[PDB]
Design a protein around this ligand. Sequence first.
Ligand SMILES: CS(=O)(=O)NC(=O)[C@@]1(F)CN(c2ncnc3[nH]c4cc(F)ccc4c23)CC12CCC2
Length: 167
Amino acid sequence: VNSFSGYLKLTDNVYIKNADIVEEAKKVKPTVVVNAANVYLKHGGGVAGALNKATNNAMQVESDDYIATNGPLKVGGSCVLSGHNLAKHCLHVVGPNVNKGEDIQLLKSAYENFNQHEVLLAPLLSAGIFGADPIHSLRVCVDTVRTNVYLAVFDKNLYDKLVSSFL
Ligand SMILES: CS(=O)(=O)NC(=O)[C@@]1(F)CN(c2ncnc3[nH]c4cc(F)ccc4c23)CC12CCC2
């Protein structure tokens, strides 16, 4: 039993809700919240900009030190950093950005990072400003992640479309 509330169950291990991931994180305080990161951990907009703002920019300060030490992430890769006031940990995961010409096949590699964590609150990778089809992203999530994933979908219209079209 865990504290996630109001989710629709899609499969044995994948759950979905219409929710603001920032507000969901602040309430649940999950062990892991997933950030829709880029390779530079520049949290300017989308989910990343919203998560960072909610930490009062502490996420960005920590991220800049991480990059200065380690260099950029790989597309499809991840790193574990602090969850600040939102979660114990933040798993920064880089899905491919279609608006940058990145290979969509890397979306499966991106979701594989979730399997290193027993339970996660996450957005749909490569959705939103990353330019991928969220329905596809949901399919890859279901077919790749084996650990327990709670997907927060900000847009109500999109959430209803994801549920209604789910095979
Ligand atoms: C409109 S969207 O639904 O298409 N979402 C997108 O475009 C995104 F940019 C933003 N994302 C979020 N996901 C869950 N909670 C969220 N709270 C937020 C609060 C914000 F001020 C901004 C973004 C989010 C957000 C997902 C996304 C796809 C990959 C990044």
